[PDB]
Design an enzyme around this catalytic site. Structure first.
Site, PDB file in Angstrom:
ATOM      1  N   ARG A  34       0.756  -1.237   0.000  1.00 56.93           N
ATOM      2  CA  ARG A  34       0.000   0.000   0.000  1.00 56.93           C
ATOM      3  C   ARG A  34       0.789   1.290   0.000  1.00 56.93           C
ATOM      4  O   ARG A  34       0.550   2.115  -0.820  1.00 56.93           O
ATOM      5  CB  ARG A  34      -0.918   0.090   1.212  1.00 56.93           C
ATOM      6  CG  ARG A  34      -2.261  -0.538   1.055  1.00 56.93           C
ATOM      7  CD  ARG A  34      -2.668  -1.199   2.348  1.00 56.93           C
ATOM      8  NE  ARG A  34      -1.778  -2.278   2.645  1.00 56.93           N
ATOM      9  CZ  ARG A  34      -1.865  -3.468   2.114  1.00 56.93           C
ATOM     10  NH1 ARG A  34      -2.846  -3.764   1.321  1.00 56.93           N
ATOM     11  NH2 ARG A  34      -0.999  -4.358   2.426  1.00 56.93           N
ATOM     12  N   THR A  35       1.742   1.411   0.901  1.00 57.51           N
ATOM     13  CA  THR A  35       2.352   2.716   1.143  1.00 57.51           C
ATOM     14  C   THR A  35       3.239   3.098  -0.014  1.00 57.51           C
ATOM     15  O   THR A  35       3.112   4.193  -0.518  1.00 57.51           O
ATOM     16  CB  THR A  35       3.092   2.837   2.529  1.00 57.51           C
ATOM     17  OG1 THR A  35       2.151   2.568   3.593  1.00 57.51           O
ATOM     18  CG2 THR A  35       3.631   4.224   2.722  1.00 57.51           C
ATOM     19  N   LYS A  90      27.612  -3.018  -1.268  1.00 57.09           N
ATOM     20  CA  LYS A  90      29.066  -2.774  -1.353  1.00 57.09           C
ATOM     21  C   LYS A  90      29.589  -2.045  -0.102  1.00 57.09           C
ATOM     22  O   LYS A  90      30.704  -1.507  -0.090  1.00 57.09           O
ATOM     23  CB  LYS A  90      29.407  -1.971  -2.633  1.00 57.09           C
ATOM     24  CG  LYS A  90      28.900  -2.582  -3.962  1.00 57.09           C
ATOM     25  CD  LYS A  90      29.532  -1.893  -5.182  1.00 57.09           C
ATOM     26  CE  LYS A  90      28.645  -1.899  -6.447  1.00 57.09           C
ATOM     27  NZ  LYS A  90      29.332  -1.122  -7.547  1.00 57.09           N
ATOM     28  N   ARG A 117      10.977   4.260   4.421  1.00 61.48           N
ATOM     29  CA  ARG A 117      10.500   3.259   5.400  1.00 61.48           C
ATOM     30  C   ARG A 117      11.711   2.451   5.868  1.00 61.48           C
ATOM     31  O   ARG A 117      12.496   1.998   5.027  1.00 61.48           O
ATOM     32  CB  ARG A 117       9.507   2.286   4.764  1.00 61.48           C
ATOM     33  CG  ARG A 117       9.135   1.137   5.689  1.00 61.48           C
ATOM     34  CD  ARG A 117       7.945   0.314   5.143  1.00 61.48           C
ATOM     35  NE  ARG A 117       6.705   1.023   5.405  1.00 61.48           N
ATOM     36  CZ  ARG A 117       5.487   0.484   5.380  1.00 61.48           C
ATOM     37  NH1 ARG A 117       5.313  -0.791   5.058  1.00 61.48           N
ATOM     38  NH2 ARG A 117       4.433   1.244   5.679  1.00 61.48           N
ATOM     39  N   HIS A 138       3.761   6.055  11.776  1.00 64.09           N
ATOM     40  CA  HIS A 138       3.398   5.999  10.370  1.00 64.09           C
ATOM     41  C   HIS A 138       2.475   7.212  10.187  1.00 64.09           C
ATOM     42  O   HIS A 138       1.259   7.061  10.174  1.00 64.09           O
ATOM     43  CB  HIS A 138       2.662   4.674  10.104  1.00 64.09           C
ATOM     44  CG  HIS A 138       2.567   4.294   8.662  1.00 64.09           C
ATOM     45  ND1 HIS A 138       2.684   5.207   7.630  1.00 64.09           N
ATOM     46  CD2 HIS A 138       2.314   3.098   8.076  1.00 64.09           C
ATOM     47  CE1 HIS A 138       2.526   4.589   6.475  1.00 64.09           C
ATOM     48  NE2 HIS A 138       2.289   3.311   6.721  1.00 64.09           N
TER      49      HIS A 138
END
Ligand SMILES: N[C@@H](CC(=O)O)C(=O)O
Ligand SMILES: N[C@@H](CC(=O)O)C(=O)O
Ligand SMILES: N[C@@H](CC(=O)O)C(=O)O
Lengths: 306, 306, 321
Positions: free
Chosen positions: B65-66, B93, B114, B142
């Site tokens: 969703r987000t 790396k 996120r 959130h």
């Protein structure tokens, strides 16, 4: 190409595309002429803004190089946009069902393009989605837009679809491309002859051949099954349409038997059933087939979303 | 434009990290901007407000969703998305988080981040020149979920003041409920909150404690329960449930106790705590909630970037 | 106001060697003009309806993102092809993959761990390919954005003293940069700063030997950032140890970076540097370039990424105009 119209195919407006069965002859010709006009404008460097602000979301639950890319490219060349959803980096890792995933992308998108290993997954998706779903491959079921682009390829390369002899070669049991193509050809065109070329274990299924019986009989379409590319198959075929596993090898030696006026096709990817020795042959249509794919996909998306 | 879609001035050029940073006036202005975005998109109008601006997602954990919602909202504003994937990046790396941030910040107008570590947002903010929008920081917050959740309540029920709301499930680890409780209690006259969770997964004390002044001066009633009792079912205007990352399940049988006018909400993805038997109920607002999410994120992105 | 560099039109970019000095300056001036317009908030629509497809067979942050961002800021579009999620799992060859993306795209941006993969792509592609890195070979667009950086930061490329530091053997960035600078500029001096096991390869230096000699470029090898290197260099261009290119041979090469060299740049080391100079790094970095340098005005390796985006806009526009 400036003065060409781009009339959307009206029968496709707002509809999901799940099967080659849903199209008429008039629909197919209208998409061919639309695709051909798309091609002319794009090739002349014209910029199309038909779908600005519309979103396609790919939902690919298995690998794809061409179908995914050509759908994205087709959407973008129409002025549309793509939301790049990935199943591996999604909430399906947290237990999310297929139906919940559909409803999710369906909240954001104007059209969903779906490929799934299960044949019945498209049905499930249709039962919850409000927006059109375009079937990009449902297990061993169908690949309807491949059938459409394949027909555009035949028409453009040979100039006619009626009257052809076509060999469908390889894994006809599991090949969703040959399933949709046989249906689209036999239902809508006056095919002369079809060679079903496969080892016995991998032959075209009854659930494809049987619904076609009335059409095959009334149009007089000649069906022949072989387990090899025989001399006769090589000599009579206007189109050799071969497929991957999932002797029938096509190489330069074999091509010495083919007509001057014919094409070799393959939905790709290929393994050794189709040798690189064929690639320089003018009759090798399997790369041009992909570019025809992008234009057919532009014709389909515009018609669906206009 | 400034008439139809006025940006919320207070958000201009600012990073969004916590539900705490918004006033009641901010929230209402966002809600009204989100409904106007909704009206324009649903009428088929094309928005060109953020042409030439780039959002880059930085998702160190999965999202359905987000991620998709933010990409769609950027596109529907006329902006663009650079599809950075952490798994295909120079992080493999040995590149640090701070250097990754500086990298995407060199190309982008807004970052959407996120991360499984709560403090990763603060590190990113110490080096970024452009706004960062917190799309989830560990078990912290959130904030855009709380915003779209509040838009969902306002749009479905008609007001947010005076509601009785149940927050159900893993309240400890639930960043969605942390932000929502903060946003609701700080800015509205909530009548009553039920915190439905075993003690082991109860709302954190570090969420409750800072809300002390607002609980007191607005006389918000707050009760814990271990189960979804009949009282909670009968009094709640909003049942907001979450993944327990006993006796909290909402199914069609439980729904027979609910008020006639109420909504069931869920930030998603769901497991068995929310039965599919509820999905056909008009009170089931958790699919609409996702679509409100897209419009709320359009209002956010436009306000931040105008 | 944004005239494309005509010599690049319709052409693949595979090597620093294909550019003339005039080409480099025209790109720099076009890049600076893109930067002025983008920074003033102007929206460009020069490549509307054109498609770039990234084809990355190894990891990237800067190069991938930078090319996508550059394409977008020109009004162009990206088809986000993913190698790990493609028909390559079903046995599709590199050549067939190239032909596939070439059917839909206007430009391919290709990074691959094999040095010869770019040539194989070229033999089958109709549309231009841009080499975003071919094994330990070259990174030509890195060399261009680096020269843009030196030009913008110091004001001149001719006359500089430059140290190339770190893994010079596997560093495709320093391969391209050394070729671009020596062929097209009058470099005063090059310090090749590396352990013996990671020194600049002979297949890079020998084709340059004529230009080095006839321009009188001084070349020194050292295994350390000595006082001389620190005091004379106008640019310190340092690199990461390329571990992913590395048996006892491998193990010898890998540990030589710390064991047989003294090449870390930290604030303490910088106390020896000139006032007017820059520290560069193509990135990503590990511990060879300390975070204690980041606050220094001479640390240009973050600004370097942003120059990268503007150089890539000048390049994409020039190739596709
Ligand atoms: N790629 C086509 C055929 C194949 O896999 O060879 C399909 O997915 O149906
Ligand atoms: N997916 C949401 C809510 C949940 O996981 O249940 C989050 O990541 O915060
Ligand atoms: N990112 C640059 C330098 C490095 O990898 O260390 C390259 O790909 O060549």
């Amino acid at each position: 190409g400036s003065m060409l119209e781009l009339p959307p195919v009206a029968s496709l407006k707002g509809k999901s595309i799940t099967s080659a069965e849903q199209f008429s002859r008039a629909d197919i010709y209208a998409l061919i002429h639309l695709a051909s006009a798309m091609q002319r404008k794009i090739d002349a460097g014209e910029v199309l803004n038909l779908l600005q602000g519309r979103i396609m979301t790919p939902l690919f639950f298995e690998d794809s190089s061409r179908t995914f890319s050509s759908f994205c490219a087709a959407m973008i060349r129409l002025g549309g946009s793509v939301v790049n959803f990935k199943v591996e980096a999604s909430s399906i890792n947290k237990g999310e069902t297929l139906a919940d995933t559909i409803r999710t992308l369906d909240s954001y998108s104007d059209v969903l393009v779906m490929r799934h290993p299960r044949q019945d997954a498209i049905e499930e998706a249709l039962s919850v989605a409000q927006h059109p779903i375009l079937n990009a491959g449902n297990g061993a079921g169908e690949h309807p837009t491949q059938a459409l682009l394949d027909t555009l390829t035949i028409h453009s390369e040979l100039g006619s679809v009626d009257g052809i002899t076509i060999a469908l070669i390889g894994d006809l049991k599991m090949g969703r491309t040959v399933h949709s193509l046989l249906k689209l050809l036999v239902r809508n065109f006056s095919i002369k002859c079809v060679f079903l070329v496969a080892p016995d274990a991998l032959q075209m299924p009854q659930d494809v051949l049987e619904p076609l019986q009335h059409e095959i009989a009334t149009k007089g379409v000649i069906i022949h099954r072989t387990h090899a590319l025989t001399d006769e198959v090589m000599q009579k075929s206007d189109v050799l349409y071969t497929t991957r596993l999932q002797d029938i090898t096509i190489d330069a030696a074999r091509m010495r038997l083919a007509k001057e006026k014919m094409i070799v096709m393959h939905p790709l990817p290929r393994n050794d059933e189709l040798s690189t020795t064929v690639d320089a042959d003018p009759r090798a249509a399997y790369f041009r087939q992909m570019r025809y794919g992008m234009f057919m996909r532009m014709a389909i998306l515009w018609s669906v979303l206009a």
